[PDB]
Tab-separated table of N, CA and C in Angstrom:
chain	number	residue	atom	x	y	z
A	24	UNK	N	127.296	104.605	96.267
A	24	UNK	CA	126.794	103.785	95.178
A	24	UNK	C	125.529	104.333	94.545
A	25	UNK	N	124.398	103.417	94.143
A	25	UNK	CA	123.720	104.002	93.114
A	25	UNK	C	122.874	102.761	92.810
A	26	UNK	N	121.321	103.009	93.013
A	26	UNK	CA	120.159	102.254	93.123
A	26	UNK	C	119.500	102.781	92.071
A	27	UNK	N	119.457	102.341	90.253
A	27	UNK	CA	118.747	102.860	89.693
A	27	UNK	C	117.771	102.047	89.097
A	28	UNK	N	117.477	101.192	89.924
A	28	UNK	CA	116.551	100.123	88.997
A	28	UNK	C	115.001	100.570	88.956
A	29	UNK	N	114.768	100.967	89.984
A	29	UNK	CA	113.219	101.446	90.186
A	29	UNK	C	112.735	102.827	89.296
A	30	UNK	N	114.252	103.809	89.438
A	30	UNK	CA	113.533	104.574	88.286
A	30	UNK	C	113.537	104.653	87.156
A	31	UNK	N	113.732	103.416	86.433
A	31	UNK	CA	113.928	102.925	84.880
A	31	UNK	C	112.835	102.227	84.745
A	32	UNK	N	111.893	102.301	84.813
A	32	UNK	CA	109.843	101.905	84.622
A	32	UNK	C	109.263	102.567	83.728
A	33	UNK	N	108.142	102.109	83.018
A	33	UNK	CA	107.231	102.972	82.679
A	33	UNK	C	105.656	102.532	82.368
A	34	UNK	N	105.781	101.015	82.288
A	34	UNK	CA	104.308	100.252	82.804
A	34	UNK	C	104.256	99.576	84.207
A	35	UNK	N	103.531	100.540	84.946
A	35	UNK	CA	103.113	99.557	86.087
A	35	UNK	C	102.505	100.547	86.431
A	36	UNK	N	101.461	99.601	87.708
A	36	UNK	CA	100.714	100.224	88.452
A	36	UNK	C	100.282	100.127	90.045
A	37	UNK	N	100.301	100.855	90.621
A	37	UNK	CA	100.385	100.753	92.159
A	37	UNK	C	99.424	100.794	92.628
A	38	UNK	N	98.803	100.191	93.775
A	38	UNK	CA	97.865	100.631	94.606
A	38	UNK	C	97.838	100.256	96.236
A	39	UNK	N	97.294	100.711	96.927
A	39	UNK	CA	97.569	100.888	98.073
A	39	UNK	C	96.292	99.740	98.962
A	40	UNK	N	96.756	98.330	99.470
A	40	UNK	CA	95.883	97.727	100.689
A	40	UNK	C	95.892	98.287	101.800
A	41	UNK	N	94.696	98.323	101.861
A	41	UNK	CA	94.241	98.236	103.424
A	41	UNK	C	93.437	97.307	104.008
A	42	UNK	N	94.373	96.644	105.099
A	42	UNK	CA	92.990	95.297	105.925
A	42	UNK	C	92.654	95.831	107.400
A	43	UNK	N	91.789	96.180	107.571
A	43	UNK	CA	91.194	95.938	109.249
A	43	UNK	C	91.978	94.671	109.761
A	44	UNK	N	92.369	93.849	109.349
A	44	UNK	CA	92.691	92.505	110.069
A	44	UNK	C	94.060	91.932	109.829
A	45	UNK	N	94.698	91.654	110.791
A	45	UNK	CA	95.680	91.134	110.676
A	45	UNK	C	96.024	89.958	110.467
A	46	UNK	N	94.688	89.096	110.858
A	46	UNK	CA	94.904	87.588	109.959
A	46	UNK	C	94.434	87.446	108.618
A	47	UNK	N	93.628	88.459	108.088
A	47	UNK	CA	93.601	88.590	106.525
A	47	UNK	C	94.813	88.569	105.743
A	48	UNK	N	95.808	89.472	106.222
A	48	UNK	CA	97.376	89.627	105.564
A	48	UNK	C	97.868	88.118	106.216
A	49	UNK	N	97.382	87.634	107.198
A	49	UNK	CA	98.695	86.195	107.236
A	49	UNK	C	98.232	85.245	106.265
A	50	UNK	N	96.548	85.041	105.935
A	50	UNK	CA	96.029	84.510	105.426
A	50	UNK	C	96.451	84.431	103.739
A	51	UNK	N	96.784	85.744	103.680
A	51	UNK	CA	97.009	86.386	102.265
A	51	UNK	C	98.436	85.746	101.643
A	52	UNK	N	99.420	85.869	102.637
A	52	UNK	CA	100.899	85.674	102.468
A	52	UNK	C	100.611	84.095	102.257
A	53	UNK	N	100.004	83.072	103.660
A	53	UNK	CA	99.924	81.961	103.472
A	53	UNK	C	99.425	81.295	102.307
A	54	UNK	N	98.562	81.501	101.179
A	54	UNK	CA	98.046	80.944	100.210
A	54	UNK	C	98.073	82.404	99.022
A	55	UNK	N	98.582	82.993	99.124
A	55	UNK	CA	98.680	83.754	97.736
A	55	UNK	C	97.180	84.067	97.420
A	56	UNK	N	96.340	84.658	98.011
A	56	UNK	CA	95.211	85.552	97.305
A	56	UNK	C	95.056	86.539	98.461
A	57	UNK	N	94.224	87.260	97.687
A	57	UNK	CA	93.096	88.243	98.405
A	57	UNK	C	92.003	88.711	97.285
A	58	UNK	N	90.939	89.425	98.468
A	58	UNK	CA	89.809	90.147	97.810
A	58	UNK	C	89.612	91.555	98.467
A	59	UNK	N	89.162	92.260	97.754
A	59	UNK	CA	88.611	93.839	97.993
A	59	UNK	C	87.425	94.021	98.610
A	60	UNK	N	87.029	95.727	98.386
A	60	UNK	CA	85.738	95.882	98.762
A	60	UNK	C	85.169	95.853	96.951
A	61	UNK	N	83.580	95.173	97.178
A	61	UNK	CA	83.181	95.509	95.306
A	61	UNK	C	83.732	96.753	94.520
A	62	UNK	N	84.050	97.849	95.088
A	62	UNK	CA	84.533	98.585	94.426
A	62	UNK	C	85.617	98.493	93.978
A	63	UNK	N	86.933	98.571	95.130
A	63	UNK	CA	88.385	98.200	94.862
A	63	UNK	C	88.544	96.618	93.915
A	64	UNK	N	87.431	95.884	94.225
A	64	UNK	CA	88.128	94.885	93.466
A	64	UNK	C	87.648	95.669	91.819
A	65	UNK	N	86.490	95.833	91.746
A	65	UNK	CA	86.487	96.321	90.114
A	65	UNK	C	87.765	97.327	89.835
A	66	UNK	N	87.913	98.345	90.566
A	66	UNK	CA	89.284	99.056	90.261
A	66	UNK	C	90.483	98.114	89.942
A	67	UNK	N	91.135	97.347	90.788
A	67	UNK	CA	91.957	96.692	90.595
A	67	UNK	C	91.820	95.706	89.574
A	68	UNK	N	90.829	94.519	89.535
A	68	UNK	CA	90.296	94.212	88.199
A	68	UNK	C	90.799	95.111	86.893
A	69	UNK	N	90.118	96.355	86.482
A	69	UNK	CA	90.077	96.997	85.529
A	69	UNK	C	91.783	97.432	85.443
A	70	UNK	N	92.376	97.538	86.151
A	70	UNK	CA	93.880	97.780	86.100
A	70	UNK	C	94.405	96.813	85.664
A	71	UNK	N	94.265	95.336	86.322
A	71	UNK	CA	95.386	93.898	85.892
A	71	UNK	C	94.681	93.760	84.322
A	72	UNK	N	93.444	93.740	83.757
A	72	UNK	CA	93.171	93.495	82.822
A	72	UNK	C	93.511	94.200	81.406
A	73	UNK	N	93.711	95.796	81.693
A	73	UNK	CA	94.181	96.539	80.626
A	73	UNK	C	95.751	96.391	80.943
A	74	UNK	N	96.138	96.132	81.692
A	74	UNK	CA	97.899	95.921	81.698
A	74	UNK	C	98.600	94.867	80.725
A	75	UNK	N	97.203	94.049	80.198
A	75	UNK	CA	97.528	93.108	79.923
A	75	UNK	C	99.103	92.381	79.625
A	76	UNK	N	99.576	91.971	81.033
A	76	UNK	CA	100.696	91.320	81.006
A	76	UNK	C	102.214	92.539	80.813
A	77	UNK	N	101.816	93.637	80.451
A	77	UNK	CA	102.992	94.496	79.851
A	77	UNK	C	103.654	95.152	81.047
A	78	UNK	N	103.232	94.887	82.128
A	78	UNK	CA	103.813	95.596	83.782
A	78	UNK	C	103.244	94.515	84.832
A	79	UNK	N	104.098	95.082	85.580
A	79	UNK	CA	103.313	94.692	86.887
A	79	UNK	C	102.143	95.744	87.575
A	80	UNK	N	101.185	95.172	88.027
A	80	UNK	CA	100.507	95.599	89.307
A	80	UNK	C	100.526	95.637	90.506
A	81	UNK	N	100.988	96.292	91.502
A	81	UNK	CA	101.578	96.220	92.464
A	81	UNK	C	100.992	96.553	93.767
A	82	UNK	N	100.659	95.980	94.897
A	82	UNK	CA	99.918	96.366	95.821
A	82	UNK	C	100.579	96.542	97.091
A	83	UNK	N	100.501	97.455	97.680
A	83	UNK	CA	101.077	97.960	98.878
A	83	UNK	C	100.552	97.536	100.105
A	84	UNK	N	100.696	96.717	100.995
A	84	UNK	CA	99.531	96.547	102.240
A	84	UNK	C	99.830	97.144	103.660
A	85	UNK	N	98.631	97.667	104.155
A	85	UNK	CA	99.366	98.060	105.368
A	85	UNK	C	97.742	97.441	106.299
A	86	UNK	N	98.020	97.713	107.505
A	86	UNK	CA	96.659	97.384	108.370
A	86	UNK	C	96.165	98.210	108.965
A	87	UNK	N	95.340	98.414	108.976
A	87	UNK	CA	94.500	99.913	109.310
A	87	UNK	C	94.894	99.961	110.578
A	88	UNK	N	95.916	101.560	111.130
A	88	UNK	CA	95.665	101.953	112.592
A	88	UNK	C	96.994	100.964	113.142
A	89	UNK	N	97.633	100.308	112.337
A	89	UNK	CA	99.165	99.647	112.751
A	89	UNK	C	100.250	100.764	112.751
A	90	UNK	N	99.939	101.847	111.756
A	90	UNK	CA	101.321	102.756	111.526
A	90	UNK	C	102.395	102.602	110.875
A	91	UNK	N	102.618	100.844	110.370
A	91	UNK	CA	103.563	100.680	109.118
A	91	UNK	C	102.379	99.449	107.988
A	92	UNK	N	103.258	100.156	106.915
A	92	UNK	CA	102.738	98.880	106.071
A	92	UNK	C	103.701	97.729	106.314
A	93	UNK	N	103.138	96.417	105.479
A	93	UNK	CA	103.669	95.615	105.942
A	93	UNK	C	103.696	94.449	104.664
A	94	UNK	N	104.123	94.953	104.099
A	94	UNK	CA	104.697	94.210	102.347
A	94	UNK	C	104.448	94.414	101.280
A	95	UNK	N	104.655	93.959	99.754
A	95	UNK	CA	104.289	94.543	98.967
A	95	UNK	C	103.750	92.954	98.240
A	96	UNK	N	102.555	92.922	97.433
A	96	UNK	CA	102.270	91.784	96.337
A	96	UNK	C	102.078	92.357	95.089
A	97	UNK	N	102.229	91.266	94.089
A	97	UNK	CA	101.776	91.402	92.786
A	97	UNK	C	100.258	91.152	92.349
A	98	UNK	N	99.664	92.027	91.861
A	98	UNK	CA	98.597	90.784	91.470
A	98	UNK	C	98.686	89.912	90.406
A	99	UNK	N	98.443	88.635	90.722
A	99	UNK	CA	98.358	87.642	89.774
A	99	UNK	C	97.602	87.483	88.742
A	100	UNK	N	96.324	87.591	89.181
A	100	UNK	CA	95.213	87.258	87.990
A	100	UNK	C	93.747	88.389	88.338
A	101	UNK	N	93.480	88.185	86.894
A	101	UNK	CA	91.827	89.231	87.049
A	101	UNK	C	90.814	88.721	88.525
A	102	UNK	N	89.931	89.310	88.783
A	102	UNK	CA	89.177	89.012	89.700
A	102	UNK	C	87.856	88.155	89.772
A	103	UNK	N	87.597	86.756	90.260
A	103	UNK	CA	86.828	85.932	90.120
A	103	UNK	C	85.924	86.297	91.449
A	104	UNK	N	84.543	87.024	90.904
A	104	UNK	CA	83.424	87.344	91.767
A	104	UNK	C	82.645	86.625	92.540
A	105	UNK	N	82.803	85.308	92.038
A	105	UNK	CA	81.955	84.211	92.899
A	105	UNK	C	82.985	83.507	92.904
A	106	UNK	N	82.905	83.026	94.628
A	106	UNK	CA	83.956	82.349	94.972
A	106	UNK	C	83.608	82.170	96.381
A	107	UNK	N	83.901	80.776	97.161
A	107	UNK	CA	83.320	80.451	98.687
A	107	UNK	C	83.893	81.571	99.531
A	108	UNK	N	81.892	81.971	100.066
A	108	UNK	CA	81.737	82.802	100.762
A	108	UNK	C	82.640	82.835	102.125
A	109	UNK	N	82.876	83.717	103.406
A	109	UNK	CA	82.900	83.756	104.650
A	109	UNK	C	84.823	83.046	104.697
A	110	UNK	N	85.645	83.226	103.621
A	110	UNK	CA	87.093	82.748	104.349
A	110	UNK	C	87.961	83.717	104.759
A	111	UNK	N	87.320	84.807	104.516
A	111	UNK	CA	88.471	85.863	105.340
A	111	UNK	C	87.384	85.913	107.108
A	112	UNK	N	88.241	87.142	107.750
A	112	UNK	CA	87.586	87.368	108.797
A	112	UNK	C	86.319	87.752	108.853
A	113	UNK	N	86.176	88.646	108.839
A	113	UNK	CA	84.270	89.264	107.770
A	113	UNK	C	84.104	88.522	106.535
A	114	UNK	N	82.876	88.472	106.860
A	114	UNK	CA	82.055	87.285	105.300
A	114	UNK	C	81.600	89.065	104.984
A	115	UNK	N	82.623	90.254	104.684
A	115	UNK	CA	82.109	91.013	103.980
A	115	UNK	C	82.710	91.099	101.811
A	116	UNK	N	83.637	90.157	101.776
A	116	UNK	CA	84.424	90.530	100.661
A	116	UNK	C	83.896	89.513	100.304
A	117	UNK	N	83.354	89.508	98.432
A	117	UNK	CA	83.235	89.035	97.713
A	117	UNK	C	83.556	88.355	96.514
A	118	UNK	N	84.532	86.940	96.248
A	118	UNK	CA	85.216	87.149	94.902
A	118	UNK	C	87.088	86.828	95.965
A	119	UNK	N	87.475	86.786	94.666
A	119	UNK	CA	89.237	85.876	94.786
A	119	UNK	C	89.956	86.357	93.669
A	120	UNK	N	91.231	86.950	94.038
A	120	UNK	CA	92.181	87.210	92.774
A	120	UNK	C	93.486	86.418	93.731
A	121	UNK	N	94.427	85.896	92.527
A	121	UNK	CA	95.910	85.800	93.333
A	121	UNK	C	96.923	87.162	93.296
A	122	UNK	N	97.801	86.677	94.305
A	122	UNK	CA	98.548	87.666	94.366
A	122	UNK	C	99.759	86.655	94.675
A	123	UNK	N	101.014	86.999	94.236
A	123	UNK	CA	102.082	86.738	94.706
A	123	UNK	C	102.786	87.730	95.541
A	124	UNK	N	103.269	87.648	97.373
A	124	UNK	CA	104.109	88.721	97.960
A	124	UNK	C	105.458	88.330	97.580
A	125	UNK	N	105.640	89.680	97.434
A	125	UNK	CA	106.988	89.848	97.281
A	125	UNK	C	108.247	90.254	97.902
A	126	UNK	N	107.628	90.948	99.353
A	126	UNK	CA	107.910	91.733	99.941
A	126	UNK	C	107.324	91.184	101.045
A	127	UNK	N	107.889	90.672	102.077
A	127	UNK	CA	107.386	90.664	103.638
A	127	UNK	C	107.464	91.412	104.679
A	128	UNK	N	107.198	92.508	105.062
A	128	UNK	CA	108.269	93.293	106.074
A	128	UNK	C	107.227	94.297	106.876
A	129	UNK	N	108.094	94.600	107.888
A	129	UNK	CA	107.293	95.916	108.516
A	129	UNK	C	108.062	97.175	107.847
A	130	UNK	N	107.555	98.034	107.716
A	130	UNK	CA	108.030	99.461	107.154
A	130	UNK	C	107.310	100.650	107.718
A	131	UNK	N	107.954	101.268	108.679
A	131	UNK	CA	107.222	102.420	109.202
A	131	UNK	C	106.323	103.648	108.755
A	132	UNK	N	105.612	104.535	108.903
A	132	UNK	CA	104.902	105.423	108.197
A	132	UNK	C	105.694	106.464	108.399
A	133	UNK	N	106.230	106.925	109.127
A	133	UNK	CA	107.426	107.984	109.023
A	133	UNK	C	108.605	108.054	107.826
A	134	UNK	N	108.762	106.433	107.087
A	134	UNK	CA	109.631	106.445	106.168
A	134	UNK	C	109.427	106.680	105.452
A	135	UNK	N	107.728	106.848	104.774
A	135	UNK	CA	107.066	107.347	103.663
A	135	UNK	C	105.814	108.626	103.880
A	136	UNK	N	106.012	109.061	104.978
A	136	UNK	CA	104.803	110.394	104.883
A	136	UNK	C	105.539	111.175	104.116
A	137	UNK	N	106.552	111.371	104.063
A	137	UNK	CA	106.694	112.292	102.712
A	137	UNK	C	106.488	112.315	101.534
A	138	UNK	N	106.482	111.423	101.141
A	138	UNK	CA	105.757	111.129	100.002
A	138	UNK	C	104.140	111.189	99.684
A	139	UNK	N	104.100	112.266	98.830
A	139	UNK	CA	102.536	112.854	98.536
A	139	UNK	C	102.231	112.598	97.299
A	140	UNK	N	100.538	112.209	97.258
A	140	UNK	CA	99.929	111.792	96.251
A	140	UNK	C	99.344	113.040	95.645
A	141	UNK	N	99.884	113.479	94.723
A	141	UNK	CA	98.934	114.763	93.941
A	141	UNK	C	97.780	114.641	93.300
A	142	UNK	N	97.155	113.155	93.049
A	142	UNK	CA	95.343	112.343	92.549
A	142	UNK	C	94.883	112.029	94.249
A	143	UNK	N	95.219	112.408	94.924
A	143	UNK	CA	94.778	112.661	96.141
A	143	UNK	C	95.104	113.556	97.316
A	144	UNK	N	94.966	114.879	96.769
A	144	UNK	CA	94.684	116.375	97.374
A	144	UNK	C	96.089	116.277	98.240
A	145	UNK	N	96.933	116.186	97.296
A	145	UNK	CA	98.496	116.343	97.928
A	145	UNK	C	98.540	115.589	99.288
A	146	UNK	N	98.057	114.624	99.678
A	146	UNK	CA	97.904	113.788	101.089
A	146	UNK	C	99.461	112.577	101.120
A	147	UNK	N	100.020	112.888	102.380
A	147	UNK	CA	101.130	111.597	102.282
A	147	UNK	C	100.252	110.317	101.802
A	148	UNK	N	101.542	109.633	101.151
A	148	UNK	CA	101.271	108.044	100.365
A	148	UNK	C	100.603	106.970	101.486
A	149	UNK	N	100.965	107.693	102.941
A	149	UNK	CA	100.681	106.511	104.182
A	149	UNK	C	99.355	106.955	104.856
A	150	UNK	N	99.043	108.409	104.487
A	150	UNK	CA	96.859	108.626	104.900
A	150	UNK	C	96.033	107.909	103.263
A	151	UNK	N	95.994	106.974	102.902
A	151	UNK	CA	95.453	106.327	101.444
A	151	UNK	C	94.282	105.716	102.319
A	152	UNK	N	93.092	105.416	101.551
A	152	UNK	CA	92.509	104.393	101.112
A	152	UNK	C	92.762	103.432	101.112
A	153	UNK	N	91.799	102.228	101.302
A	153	UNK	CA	91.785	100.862	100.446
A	153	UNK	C	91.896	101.235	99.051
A	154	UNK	N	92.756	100.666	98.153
A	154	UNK	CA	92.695	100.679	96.525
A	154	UNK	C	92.659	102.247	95.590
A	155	UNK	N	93.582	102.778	96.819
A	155	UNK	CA	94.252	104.220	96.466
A	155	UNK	C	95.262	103.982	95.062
A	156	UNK	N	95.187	104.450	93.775
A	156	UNK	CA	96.098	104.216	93.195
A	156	UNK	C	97.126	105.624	93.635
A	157	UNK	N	98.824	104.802	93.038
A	157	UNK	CA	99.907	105.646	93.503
A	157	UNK	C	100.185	106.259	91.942
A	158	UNK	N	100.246	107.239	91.614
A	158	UNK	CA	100.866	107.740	90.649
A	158	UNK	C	102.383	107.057	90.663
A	159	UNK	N	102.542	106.505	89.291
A	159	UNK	CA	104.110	105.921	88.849
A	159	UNK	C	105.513	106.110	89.399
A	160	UNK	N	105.214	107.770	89.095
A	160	UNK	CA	106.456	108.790	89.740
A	160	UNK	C	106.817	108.057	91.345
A	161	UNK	N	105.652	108.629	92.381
A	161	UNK	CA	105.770	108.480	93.363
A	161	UNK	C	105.470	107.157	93.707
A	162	UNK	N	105.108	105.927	93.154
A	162	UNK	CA	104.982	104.025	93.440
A	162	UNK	C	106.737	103.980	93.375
A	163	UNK	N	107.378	104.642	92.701
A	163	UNK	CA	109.256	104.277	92.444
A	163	UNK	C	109.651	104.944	93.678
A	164	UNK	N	109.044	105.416	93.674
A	164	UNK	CA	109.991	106.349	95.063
A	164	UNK	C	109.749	105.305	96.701
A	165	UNK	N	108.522	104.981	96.980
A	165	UNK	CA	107.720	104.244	97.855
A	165	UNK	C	108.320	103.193	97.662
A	166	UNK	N	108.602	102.123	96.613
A	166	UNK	CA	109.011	100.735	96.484
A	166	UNK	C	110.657	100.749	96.639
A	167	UNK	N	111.451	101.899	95.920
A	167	UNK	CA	112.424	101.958	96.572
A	167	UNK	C	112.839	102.369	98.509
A	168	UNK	N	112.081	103.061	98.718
A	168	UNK	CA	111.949	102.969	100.127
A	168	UNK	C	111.913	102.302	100.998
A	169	UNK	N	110.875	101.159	100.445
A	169	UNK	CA	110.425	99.505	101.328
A	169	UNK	C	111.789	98.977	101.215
A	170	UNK	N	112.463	99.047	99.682
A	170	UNK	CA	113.058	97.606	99.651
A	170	UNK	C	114.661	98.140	100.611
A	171	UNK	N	114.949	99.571	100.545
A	171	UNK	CA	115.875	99.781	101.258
A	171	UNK	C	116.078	99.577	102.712
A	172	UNK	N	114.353	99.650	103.305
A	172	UNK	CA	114.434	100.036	104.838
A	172	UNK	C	115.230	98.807	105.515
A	173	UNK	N	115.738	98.845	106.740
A	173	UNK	CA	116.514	97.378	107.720
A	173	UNK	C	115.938	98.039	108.532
């Protein structure tokens, strides 16, 4: 057969979570938000806002030092900087965006180290950053991957 939906795109944008914590992601799934580090959230910010509405934004999550990611969300809305302090695990993140998941799952890092980021010194898609963006090309290749794995 024949899976061609993912590579028929041409607005969207990917980026790659990372949480130290694993009740941050249950937290995340349970009520539809998250927040960044000040940096990643302005990155991501500056992405949902020039998209304006014409793609999705797409976020990849995995947990630092787990070895698979573990779903994919949308982001919902721009990023609101003040917002009650201390509800994730660390009172280190500042600020609230929504996200809708879309994707619940475990997905191994072996299913995607092949996949290399060339805006990051040819490195597999699964050694990223917090708020690594994925080049387009390779976000289709990665999202088809997730949604295939059992």
């Amino acid at each position: 057969g024949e899976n061609l939906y993912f590579q028929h795109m041409k607005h969207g944008r990917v980026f790659i979570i990372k949480s130290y914590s694993e009740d941050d992601i249950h937290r995340s799934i349970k009520y539809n938000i998250w927040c960044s580090t000040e940096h990643g959230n302005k990155r991501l910010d500056a992405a949902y806002r020039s998209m304006n509405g014409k793609g999705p934004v797409y976020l990849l999550f995995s947990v630092n030092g787990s070895g698979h990611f573990c779903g994919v969300a949308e982001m919902k809305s721009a990023v609101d900087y003040n917002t009650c302090a201390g509800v994730w695990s660390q009172d280190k993140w500042k600020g609230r965006f929504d996200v809708r998941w879309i994707f619940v799952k475990d997905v191994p890092n072996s299913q995607l180290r092949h996949i290399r980021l060339e805006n990051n010194e040819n490195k597999p898609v699964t050694n990223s950053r917090d708020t690594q963006e994925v080049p387009l090309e390779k976000a289709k290749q990665v999202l088809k991957i997730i949604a295939s794995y059992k």
